[PDB]
Amino acid sequence: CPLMVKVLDAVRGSPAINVAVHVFRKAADDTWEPFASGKTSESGELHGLTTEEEFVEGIYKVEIDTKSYWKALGISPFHEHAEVVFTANDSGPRRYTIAALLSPYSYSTTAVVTN
Amino acid sequence: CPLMVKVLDAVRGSPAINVAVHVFRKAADDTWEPFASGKTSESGELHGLTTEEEFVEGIYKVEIDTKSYWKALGISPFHEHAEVVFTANDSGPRRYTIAALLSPYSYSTTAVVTN
Amino acid sequence: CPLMVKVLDAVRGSPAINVAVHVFRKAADDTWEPFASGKTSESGELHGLTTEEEFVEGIYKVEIDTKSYWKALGISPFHEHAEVVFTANDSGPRRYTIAALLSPYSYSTTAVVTN
Amino acid sequence: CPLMVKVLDAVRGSPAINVAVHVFRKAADDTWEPFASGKTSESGELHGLTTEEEFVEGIYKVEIDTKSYWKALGISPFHEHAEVVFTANDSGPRRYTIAALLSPYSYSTTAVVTN
Numbered sequence: 485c486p487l488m489v490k491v492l493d494a495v496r497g498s499p500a501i502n503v504a505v506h507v508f509r510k511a512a513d514d515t516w517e518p519f520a521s522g523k524t525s526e527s528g529e530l531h532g533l534t535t536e537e538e539f540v541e542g543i544y545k546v547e548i549d550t551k552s553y554w555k556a557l558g559i560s561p562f563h564e565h566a567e568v569v570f571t572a573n574d575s576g577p578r579r580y581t582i583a584a585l586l587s588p589y590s591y592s593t594t595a596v597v598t599n
Numbered sequence: 600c601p602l603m604v605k606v607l608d609a610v611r612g613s614p615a616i617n618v619a620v621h622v623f624r625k626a627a628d629d630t631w632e633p634f635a636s637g638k639t640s641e642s643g644e645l646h647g648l649t650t651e652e653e654f655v656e657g658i659y660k661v662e663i664d665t666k667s668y669w670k671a672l673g674i675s676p677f678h679e680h681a682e683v684v685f686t687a688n689d690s691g692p693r694r695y696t697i698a699a700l701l702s703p704y705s706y707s708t709t710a711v712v713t714n
Numbered sequence: 715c716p717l718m719v720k721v722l723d724a725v726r727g728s729p730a731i732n733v734a735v736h737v738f739r740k741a742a743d744d745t746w747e748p749f750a751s752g753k754t755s756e757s758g759e760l761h762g763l764t765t766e767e768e769f770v771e772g773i774y775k776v777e778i779d780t781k782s783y784w785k786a787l788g789i790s791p792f793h794e795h796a797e798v799v800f801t802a803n804d805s806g807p808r809r810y811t812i813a814a815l816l817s818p819y820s821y822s823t824t825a826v827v828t829n
Numbered sequence: 830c831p832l833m834v835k836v837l838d839a840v841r842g843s844p845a846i847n848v849a850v851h852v853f854r855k856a857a858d859d860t861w862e863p864f865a866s867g868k869t870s871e872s873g874e875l876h877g878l879t880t881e882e883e884f885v886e887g888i889y890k891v892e893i894d895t896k897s898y899w900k901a902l903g904i905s906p907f908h909e910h911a912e913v914v915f916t917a918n919d920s921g922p923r924r925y926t927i928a929a930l931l932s933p934y935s936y937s938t939t940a941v942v943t944n
């Protein structure tokens with residue numbers, strides 16, 4: 485599993501559960517084509533978005549549906565979502581963990597990339 | 600005046616100077632349309648993006664061109680850009696300041712909305 | 715003027731107003747001595763902490779009283795305070811701005827050092 | 830294992846390996862008594878700092894020796910360390926994960942607390 489997404493709630497101090505995540509990949513025509521999607525588990529993690537075969541070189545966008553999450557908790561947040569845009573596998577195949585830490589008016593995202 | 604963007608560099612401990620910033624507004628045809636842009640000053644700030652007349656309710660996207668910034672410093676970056684997607688809502692007099700703190704493999708963004 | 719502290723609230727999307735800030739300087743006896751303190755203004759900023767004459771090289775600790783801030787808003791916090799411990803080093807004319815972005819269970823701090 | 834510490838490098842996009850971590854607990858006399866210490870693994874994680882028996886209610890300080898880490902990488906950073914101060918087990922025994930994301934002039938820390 486070369487791509488994992490983790491989401492944390494900075495208000496509750498907990499994993500962010502049931503958060504919708506959409507991954508897009510830039511196509512030839514410069515448009516964003518749907519690549520994969522899922523929901524975070526009880527651990528705030530989303531595995532199994534892709535396989536080494538499908539996860540080719542390209543420009544990817546990971547959209548984390550933060551607004552829906554905060555709205556489900558009765559909170560009216562600032563952002564529509566958190567978006568992480570990056571080139572992958574540009575220098576050989578790696579494993580990417582994309583993490584987002586969420587607050588109503590802020591988010592922090594990081595990437596851990598291991599060979 | 601209703602919209603300001605500020606960018607900080609977590610590696611150098613300084614404002615992020617000369618960073619390109621592009622703002623888009625979601626059109627009725629569900630597509631992103633260029634709205635405003637510029638480059639951050641020596642203070643890491645970009646003022647004069649828009650006016651009260653032009654800055655109506657709607658969905659906006661701020662793209663901060665982080666990859667080019669890091670490239671210019673000779674530091675290896677992960678993200679193509681930092682993106683901040685938000686709904687502007689009228690609720691009395693509001694100024695929006697969108698701030699981003701940049702590291703090569705991470706960023707933190709916050710919104711400060713004041714009357 | 716050589717030291718400024720700024721505090722932001724990631725839950726309300728606003729400056730963190732009236733937050734207590736205590737600064738200490740490490741003494742030769744290896745203990746922390748009160749150096750400067752105050753409360754953040756309506757802009758979330760605390761100016762006038764010290765002067766160029768008083769702000770010599772040394773090791774400093776800035777404690778931002780986050781627990782009391784959250785308590786005053788009725789929000790359940792994790793940290794007793796946010797702490798930022800740093801060495802002040804002379805290297806031409808420097809102003810240090812220490813910024814903290816607060817959530818109930820998280821904080822992000824950065825230093826911006828300008829000439 | 831009721832206390833785990835994780836450290837990530839925002840410059841390299843990797844776990845922060847071999848980082849020294851010291852945990853203190855506030856004693857009766859209001860002084861910081863040594864509680865536990867360790868080093869992060871190849872995964873940037875530090876388990877086994879304590880046991881449910883030893884990890885009683887109290888005010889704890891987790892000091893992450895960030896300066897030594899950045900210095901070992903040839904980098905001269907801003908902070909002496911990152912410090913996380915919190916009351917634990919004030920409302921029954923929990924499991925605490927304290928995470929820090931490190932850059933030369935900035936750090937972000939969060940807590941995930943699970944029952």
Ligand SMILES: COC(=O)CCNC(=O)c1cc(-c2ccc(F)cc2F)cc(I)c1O
Pocket residue numbers: 605607696697698699700707708709711713720722728729756757758811813814815822823824826
């Ligand atoms: C009324 O208050 C304002 O207009 C605040 C605008 N400034 C900011 O949001 C800001 C935000 C940060 C900041 C951003 C992200 C983060 F993770 C930590 C920060 F301190 C740092 C500085 I120095 C800032 O000036």
Ligand SMILES: COC(=O)CCNC(=O)c1cc(-c2ccc(F)cc2F)cc(I)c1O
Pocket residue numbers: 490492581582583584585592593594595596835837843844871872873926928929930937938939941
């Ligand atoms: C080898 O190490 C990994 O697989 C890293 C995957 N995890 C993360 O990136 C991670 C990241 C954070 C984190 C994210 C944003 C931020 F501002 C601070 C953080 F600690 C917290 C936790 I708890 C995590 O596990």
